[PDB]
């Protein structure tokens, strides 16, 4: 487990600039991030176990997202992940 | 930073170290993971904050998070499967 509160709060300021969050709601959001990330990371690790030298790249995360997220959430998440990787490889 | 290069708020470097802690692990796997966690966080917080606003309060509480998730079949199914263990 890792603390993601600062990041959850930065995103809250983007979406609802003048809205706060209670301590218990932030605890639930930290559990949300950690638990979803554990499922993503676990599925990516399972897929990488099939790779000759166990390589993990964005493909294993994309395939995990498609398996784990339902319908439109998966479509949007894939679009967000692909856009972030495109930005990352194009920039320094 | 890797997060700035990716246009993200979520911590790409820390996520990359977590993936390595569990073979070559590309930084793109950490960028893609941070992007999907940031996307899901933004969707949940926006819907919960809209429930807070409709209730004429100034903060998100666990009940607003529950109202958000219950009002979206995809978020409800994702949380149900996460709690179940997939």
């Amino acid at each position: 487990k890792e603390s993601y509160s600062i990041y959850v709060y930065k995103v809250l300021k983007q979406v609802h600039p003048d809205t706060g969050i209670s301590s218990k709601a932030m605890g639930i959001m930290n559990s949300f991030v950690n638990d979803i990330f554990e499922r993503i990371a676990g599925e990516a690790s399972r897929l990488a176990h099939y790779n000759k030298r166990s390589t993990i790249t964005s493909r294993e995360i994309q395939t995990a997202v498609r398996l784990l997220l339902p319908g439109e959430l998966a479509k949007h998440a894939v679009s967000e992940g692909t856009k972030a990787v495109t930005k990352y490889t194009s920039a320094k | 930073s890797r997060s700035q290069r990716a246009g993200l708020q979520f911590p790409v470097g820390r996520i990359h170290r977590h993936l390595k802690s569990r073979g070559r692990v590309g930084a793109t796997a950490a960028v893609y993971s941070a992007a999907i966690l940031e996307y899901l966080t933004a969707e949940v917080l926006e819907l919960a904050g809209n429930a807070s606003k409709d209730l004429k309060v100034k903060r998100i509480t666990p009940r607003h998070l529950q109202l958000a998730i219950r009002g979206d079949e995809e978020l409800d199914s994702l949380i149900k499967a996460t709690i179940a263990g997939g």
């Binding site: 706060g20 301590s23 218990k24 932030m26 605890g27 559990s31 | 509480t61 949380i79």
Partner: peptide, 23 residues
């Protein structure tokens, strides 16, 4: 610390003493 399973309680009754998260 609050588990994600908190969301699957029949009906969450918000705690009066649920302090504000502080940046």
């Amino acid at each position: 610390e609050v588990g994600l399973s908190y969301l699957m309680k029949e009906e969450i009754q918000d705690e009066e003493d649920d302090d504000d998260y502080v940046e």
